[PDB]
Amino acid sequence: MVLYFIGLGLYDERDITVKGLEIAKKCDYVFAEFYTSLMAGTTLGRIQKLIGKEIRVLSREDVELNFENIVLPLAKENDVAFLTPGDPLVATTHAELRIRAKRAGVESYVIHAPSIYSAVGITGLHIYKFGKSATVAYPEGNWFPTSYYDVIKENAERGLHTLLFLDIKAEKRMYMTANEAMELLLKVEDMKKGGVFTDDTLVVVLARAGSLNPTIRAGCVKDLIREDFGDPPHILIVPGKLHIVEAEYLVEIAGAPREILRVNV
Amino acid sequence: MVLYFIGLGLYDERDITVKGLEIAKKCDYVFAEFYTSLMAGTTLGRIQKLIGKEIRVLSREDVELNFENIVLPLAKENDVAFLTPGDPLVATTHAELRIRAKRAGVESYVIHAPSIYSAVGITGLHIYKFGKSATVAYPEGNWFPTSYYDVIKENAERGLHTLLFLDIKAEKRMYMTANEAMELLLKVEDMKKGGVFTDDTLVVVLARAGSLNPTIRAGCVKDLIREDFGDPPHILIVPGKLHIVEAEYLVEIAGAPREILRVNV
Numbered sequence: 001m002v003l004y005f006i007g008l009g010l011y012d013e014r015d016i017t018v019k020g021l022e023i024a025k026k027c028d029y030v031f032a033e034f035y036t037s038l039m040a041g042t043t044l045g046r047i048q049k050l051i052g053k054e055i056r057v058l059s060r061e062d063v064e065l066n067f068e069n070i071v072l073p074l075a076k077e078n079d080v081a082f083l084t085p086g087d088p089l090v091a092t093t094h095a096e097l098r099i100r101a102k103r104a105g106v107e108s109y110v111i112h113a114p115s116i117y118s119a120v121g122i123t124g125l126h127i128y129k130f131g132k133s134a135t136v137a138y139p140e141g142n143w144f145p146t147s148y149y150d151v152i153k154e155n156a157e158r159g160l161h162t163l164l165f166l167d168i169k170a171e172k173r174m175y176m177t178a179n180e181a182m183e184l185l186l187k188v189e190d191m192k193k194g195g196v197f198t199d200d201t202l203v204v205v206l207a208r209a210g211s212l213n214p215t216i217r218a219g220c221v222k223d224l225i226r227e228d229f230g231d232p233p234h235i236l237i238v239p240g241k242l243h244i245v246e247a248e249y250l251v252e253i254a255g256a257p258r259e260i261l262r263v264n265v
Numbered sequence: 266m267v268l269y270f271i272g273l274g275l276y277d278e279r280d281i282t283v284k285g286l287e288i289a290k291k292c293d294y295v296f297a298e299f300y301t302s303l304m305a306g307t308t309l310g311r312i313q314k315l316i317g318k319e320i321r322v323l324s325r326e327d328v329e330l331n332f333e334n335i336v337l338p339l340a341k342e343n344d345v346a347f348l349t350p351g352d353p354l355v356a357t358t359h360a361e362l363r364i365r366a367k368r369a370g371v372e373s374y375v376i377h378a379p380s381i382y383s384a385v386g387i388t389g390l391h392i393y394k395f396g397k398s399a400t401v402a403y404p405e406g407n408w409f410p411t412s413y414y415d416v417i418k419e420n421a422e423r424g425l426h427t428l429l430f431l432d433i434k435a436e437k438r439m440y441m442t443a444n445e446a447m448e449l450l451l452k453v454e455d456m457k458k459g460g461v462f463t464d465d466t467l468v469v470v471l472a473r474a475g476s477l478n479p480t481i482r483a484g485c486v487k488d489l490i491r492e493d494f495g496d497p498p499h500i501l502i503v504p505g506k507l508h509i510v511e512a513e514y515l516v517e518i519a520g521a522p523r524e525i526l527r528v529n530v
């Protein structure tokens with residue numbers, strides 16, 4: 001009579017924690033969703049093979065509208081696991097699912113996994129210096145989202161870094177590239193003219209964190225906007241005021257122009 | 266010729282990822298540090314037994330002053346692993362270690378693991394709403410640091426949550442409790458009187474994140490300041506204004522008082 005929320009990590013099936021694997025291996029039923037993020041280095045088959053169980057993949061609709069009809073029923077009489085990319089409760093609405101489990105008289109436990117939220121550390125930017133986070137969403141029809149632009153503005157004024165999750169439309173197999181995010185932001189700048197995101201703005205790109213050779217790049221928008229960062233997923237970061245050691249790392253590791261070594265203070 | 270920065274995860278020896286464990290087992294030399302944090306749910310012996318390699322523990326000075334004379338020389342002719350609690354490169358000064366490896370002609374790769382930065386998502390607080398983070402340091406002598414108080418102020422002012430790490434003396438294995446952190450903040454409030462941290466302020470306490478049975482509590486400072494949250498480590502969070510969904514999770518999962526559904530939303 002237990003439900004396990006288990007994260008699978010950043011890139012492939014091996015990013016799951018040992019705790020998560022051992023517990024998953026012993027669950028009666030295993031469910032999972034792969035719409036909240038992209039695990040570019042694995043396949044359902046490899047995950048199933050590793051866990052030694054069949055995995056019933058659920059759609060966003062299955063989860064958001066039918067979690068209590070598809071998963072909870074079995075958790076009332078068995079040990080059930082629900083797998084997700086990265087950490088199960090990060091930048092998702094999955095936390096609320098625990099309230100649903102509770103209301104159904106089902107106990108739930110959470111097994112964390114590496115998340116893009118902490119993986120940003122590989123960019124050299126001090127993680128405590130990150131401010132509010134946001135998501136660059138694809139415009140649809142006449143609706144053109146722009147709130148994420150205001151988040152960068154608010155953080156930048158405080159000298160804080162901004163983590164930008166990029167949009168994803170799993171059913172259409174669409175994964176926003178850092179390039180597309182930069183294009184959208186330049187358009188918002190043209191509209192708002194707040195001097196928040198321009199061709200000279202320094203940005204950082206982290207692609208396929210979790211893999212052994214992720215792409216880590218830093219530089220002016222004008223120079224990176226047309227660069228190929230490899231396959232998704234990508235995240236975009238707009239740093240705030242940099243510490244000298246952050247700049248050094250960006251230059252030495254992310255190939256940023258030596259020019260940024262000269263921090264204004 | 267290769268140095269692997271491997272995260273050990275949140276709480277015990279099983280919090281390392283399958284990737285991290287398999288890679289560690291293949292290394293000729295394995296180093297680790299426990300001064301930035303400790304794995305309170307396990308021991309060096311259990312970690313060593315799991316990895317099946319003797320682990321040479323390094324102190325803060327060993328790392329910060331002599332990383333290149335202790336770790337890097339061996340990494341030039343062998344596969345070397347450097348284990349740290351949580352996610353590698355989260356601790357402020359670790360990213361710089363990759364620069365030292367580069368300068369030494371040594372390749373380095375990062376193997377992520379769960380970090381408290383993302384694990385706090387288990388409190389039900391939306392990850393994107395966290396602002397700048399800080400550490401609550403013990404006053405001492407004529408030194409009474411209060412910057413962490415200003416961090417809370419600036420975040421809450423913008424409706425953002427504040428993640429507060431509590432002071433730790435690794436060597437002496439002396440943890441700051443959430444209770445202690447609260448008393449300190451109340452004392453800082455009585456000095457700056459900015460109306461930031463009072464007896465009525467809503468706070469969240471997360472203890473032993475990573476374990477299957479963590480302690481998640483929420484309520485006013487006056488009612489939690491004397492409560493027993495169990496064994497360390499403890500993490501303190503001062504939430505900004507709550508999303509109704511956040512509040513509902515805190516009430517249903519963390520036993521928060523029903524009143525936050527109207528008082529803090």
Ligand SMILES: Nc1ncnc2c1ncn2[C@@H]1O[C@H](CSCC[C@H](N)C(=O)O)[C@@H](O)[C@H]1O
Nearest residue numbers: 037086087090115116165166208209233234
């Ligand atoms: N390995 C990875 N590399 C780069 N970006 C990633 C990533 N994994 C997730 N993301 C980013 O985050 C978005 C999904 S948000 C959900 C995040 C997940 N719970 C976690 O803990 O990581 C993606 O669209 C992408 O922009």
